[PDB]
Nucleic acid binder design. Structure first.
Ligand code: K
Ligand code: K
Ligand code: K
Ligand code: MG
Ligand code: MG
Length: 136
RNA sequence: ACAU
DNA sequence: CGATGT
């Protein structure tokens, strides 16, 4: 089982969980940063991992790329497959933004098609995903 | 247990 | 040590 180097890797970063959430996508081979989301003041790790995958799908579709996406998040991979982010985060004024983005990401999934493989990055074999924030 |  | 999730 080998790394598919012609791929996009994504990952969340946070200050607290729940806390300030951001995410980014990088070229797995080179580490080049292809997109970075502006920090969101309150979210969860899994909401961020979900948004990162969906952004990756939208990024690749816009560019007519068939590359797969790596994610280290078992949860977010499942949520994307299901087209449903099963977060426990309370909905209130301070979580409104992240929930708006999660709702809109789900909506995008429900109105678009893709063949992009969404693959588990095997951290136990390969070390940290290339999109990692180096904060742990 | 597993993944974050 | 704590949290988010299956
Ligand atoms: K990190
Ligand atoms: K990890
Ligand atoms: K647990
Ligand atoms: Mg991750
Ligand atoms: Mg990481």
């Amino acid at each position: 089982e080998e790394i598919i180097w012609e791929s996009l890797s994504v990952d969340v970063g946070s200050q607290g969980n729940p806390g300030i959430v951001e995410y980014k996508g990088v070229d797995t081979k080179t580490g080049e940063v292809l997109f970075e989301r502006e920090p969101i003041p309150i979210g969860t790790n899994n909401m961020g991992e979900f948004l990162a995958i969906v952004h990756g799908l939208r990024y690749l579709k816009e560019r007519n790329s068939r590359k797969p996406i790596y994610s280290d998040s078992q949860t977010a991979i499942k949520w994307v497959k299901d087209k449903k982010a099963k977060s426990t985060l309370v909905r209130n004024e301070e979580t409104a933004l992240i929930w708006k983005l999660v709702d809109e990401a789900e909506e995008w999934l429900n109105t678009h098609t893709y063949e992009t493989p969404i693959l588990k990055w095997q951290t136990d074999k390969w070390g940290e995903i290339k999109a990692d924030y180096g904060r742990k």
